[PDB]
């Protein structure tokens, strides 16, 4: 997603906001990075998953400065090129390196 | 019927300090009357339980902390890590207050006030209430000082009394 849709989805999900896309993405990164980098780190970040039709809705709910902050990733099935380039070839590379 | 006065600097007119009085019956949850003034004119409005409940529900925030946020904002009692901004549209007589993050403006509350027809009465009532509170506080402080002096004298005497007792 680019910056144009970030503002629209922020307006739709959590209303009564007056923030630009840059600050929204900065907050999202500050929320997400600590969890992904290391686990077992309570950060009041509720994660939920759902599927509707060949799609994955990933809902993240957080509290910044004691106020709600909702975001939804509307992920769609990845193309064959992306899946291969991100999982298949690297895996064979690691296998060959370990064999060596 | 408790009341609280606060000083607010509207963004529209930073150079002027406006006064905001919030009156509640027994608890902040039951609704409150808000009067905003600048020394010449005043606007008065009311908020009931239904309005506050609906506003809390719309925000999708737990009602246990919405009242706390309103207390920290309207009553001007808050720490250094939080800042609130109030805006008042005169023509639309619309008063909304929000919490200001780093370029992330979150709205907290919005109400509509009506122009009063007796500004002098409101100002006089505010001044009289302030003077009465000052007088009551002074009397209470004097009474507390007298009690403290009495206790100090009693303790000073009993010290020597204990000295004599241990001597015997």
From Swiss-Prot, chain A:
Effect of residue 16 to G: Does not affect ability to participate in V(D)J recombination
Subcellular location field: Nucleus; Chromosome
Post-translational modification: Phosphorylated by PRKDC at the C-terminus in response to DNA damage. Phosphorylations by PRKDC at the C-terminus of XRCC4 and NHEJ1/XLF are highly redundant and regulate ability of the XRCC4-NHEJ1/XLF subcomplex to bridge DNA. Phosphorylation does not prevent interaction with XRCC4 but disrupts ability to bridge DNA and promotes detachment from DNA.
Annotated consequence of substituting residue 16 to E: Abolished ability to repair double-strand breaks (DSBs). Abolished interaction with XRCC4. Abolished ability to participate in V(D)J recombination
Effect of residue 68 to D: Does not affect ability to participate in V(D)J recombination
Superkingdom: Eukaryota
Reported tissue expression: Ubiquitously expressed.
Variant or mutagenesis effect after changing residue 69 to D: Abolished ability to participate in V(D)J recombination
Site (Leu-lock): 67
Residues covered by region (Globular head): 1-87
Residues modified as Phosphoserine: 84
UniProt-reported outcome of changing residue 84 to D: In XLF-Asp mutant; phospho-mimetic mutant; abolished ability to bridge DNA
Outcome following mutation: residue 31 to P: In IMD124; uncertain significance
Record-stated family: Belongs to the XRCC4-XLF family. XLF subfamily.
Miscellaneous comment in the UniProt entry for this protein: Was named 'Cernunnos' after the enigmatic Celtic god of hunting, the underworld and fertility.
Domain remarks in the Swiss-Prot or TrEMBL record: The coiled-coil region mediates homodimerization. The Leu-lock (Leu-67) site inserts into a hydrophobic pocket in XRCC4.
Disease / disorder: Immunodeficiency 124, severe combined: A form of severe combined immunodeficiency (SCID), a genetically and clinically heterogeneous group of rare congenital disorders characterized by impairment of both humoral and cell-mediated immunity, leukopenia and low or absent antibody levels. Patients with SCID present in infancy with recurrent, persistent infections by opportunistic organisms. The common characteristic of all types of SCID is absence of T-cell-mediated cellular immunity due to a defect in T- cell development.
Quaternary assembly: Homodimer; mainly exists as a homodimer when not associated with XRCC4. Interacts with XRCC4; the interaction is direct and is mediated via a head-to-head interaction between N-terminal head regions. Component of the core long-range non-homologous end joining (NHEJ) complex (also named DNA-PK complex) composed of PRKDC, LIG4, XRCC4, XRCC6/Ku70, XRCC5/Ku86 and NHEJ1/XLF. Additional component of the NHEJ complex includes PAXX.
Descriptive protein name: Non-homologous end-joining factor 1
Species whose genome carries this gene: Homo sapiens (Human)
Gene transcribed to yield this protein: NHEJ1
Shown part of the complete sequence: 49 to 148 of 299
Curated annotation (Swiss-Prot), chain B:
Known outcome of mutating residue 140 to R: No change in sumoylation
Location of the region described as Interaction with IFFO1 in the Swiss-Prot/TrEMBL record: 1-168
GO biological process: one example: double-strand break repair
Tissues with expression: Widely expressed.
Post-translation changes: Phosphorylations by PRKDC at the C-terminus of XRCC4 and NHEJ1/XLF are highly redundant and regulate ability of the XRCC4-NHEJ1/XLF subcomplex to bridge DNA. Phosphorylation by PRKDC does not prevent interaction with NHEJ1/XLF but disrupts ability to bridge DNA and promotes detachment from DNA.
Coiled coil segments of this chain: 131-165
Effect of residue 90 to E: Abolished ability to bridge DNA
Mutation effect (residue 161 to Q): In SSMED; no expression of the protein is observed; complete loss of function in DNA double-strand break repair
Sites of Phosphoserine modification: 53
Localization in the cell: Nucleus; Chromosome
Keywords: Chromosome, Coiled coil, Cytoplasm, Disease variant, DNA damage, DNA recombination, DNA repair, DNA-binding, Dwarfism, Isopeptide bond, Nucleus, Phosphoprotein, Ubl conjugation
GO molecular function, one term: identical protein binding
Effect of residue 43 to R: In SSMED; impairs the protein function in DNA double-strand break repair
Entry GO CC: cytosol; DNA ligase IV complex; DNA-dependent protein kinase-DNA ligase 4 complex; nonhomologous end joining complex; nucleoplasm; nucleus; site of double-strand break
Main location: nucleus
Effect on the protein upon substituting residue 61 to R: Abolished interaction with NHEJ1/XLF
Disease / disorder: Short stature, microcephaly, and endocrine dysfunction: A disease characterized by short stature and microcephaly apparent at birth, progressive postnatal growth failure, and endocrine dysfunction. In affected adults endocrine features include hypergonadotropic hypogonadism, multinodular goiter, and diabetes mellitus. Variable features observed in some patients are progressive ataxia, and lymphopenia or borderline leukopenia.
UniProt family annotation: Belongs to the XRCC4-XLF family. XRCC4 subfamily.
This protein's name: DNA repair protein XRCC4
Organism: Homo sapiens
Covered range of the whole protein: 1 to 168 of 336
């Amino acid at each position: 997603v680019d910056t144009s849709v970030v503002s629209q989805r922020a307006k739709e999900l959590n209303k009564r906001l007056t923030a630009p896309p840059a600050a929204f993405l900065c907050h999202l990164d500050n929320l997400l990075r600590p969890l992904l980098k290391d686990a077992a780190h309570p950060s009041e970040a509720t994660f939920s998953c759902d599927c509707v039709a060949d799609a994955l809705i990933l809902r993240v709910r957080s509290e910044l400065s004691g106020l709600p902050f909702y975001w939804n990733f509307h992920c769609m099935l990845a193309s064959p090129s992306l899946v291969s380039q991100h999982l298949i070839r690297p895996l064979m590379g690691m296998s060959l390196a370990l064999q060596c | 019927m408790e009341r609280k006065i606060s000083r607010i600097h509207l963004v529209s007119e930073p150079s002027i300090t406006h006064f905001l009085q919030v009156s509640w019956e027994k608890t902040l949850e039951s609704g409150f009357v808000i009067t905003l003034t600048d020394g010449h004119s005043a606007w008065t409005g009311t908020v009931s339980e239904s309005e506050i409940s609906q506003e809390a529900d719309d925000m999708a925030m737990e009602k246990g902390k919405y009242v706390g946020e309103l207390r920290k904002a309207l009553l001007s009692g808050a720490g250094p890590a939080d800042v609130y901004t109030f805006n008042f549209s005169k023509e639309s007589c619309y008063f909304f207050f929000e919490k200001n993050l780093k370029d992330v403006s979150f709205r907290l509350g919005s109400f509509n006030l009506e122009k009063v027809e007796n500004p002098a009465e409101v100002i006089r009532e505010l001044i009289c209430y302030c003077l009465d509170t000052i007088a009551e506080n002074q009397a209470k402080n004097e009474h507390l000082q007298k009690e403290n002096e009495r206790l100090l004298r009693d303790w000073n005497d009993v010290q020597g009394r204990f000295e004599k007792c241990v001597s015997a």
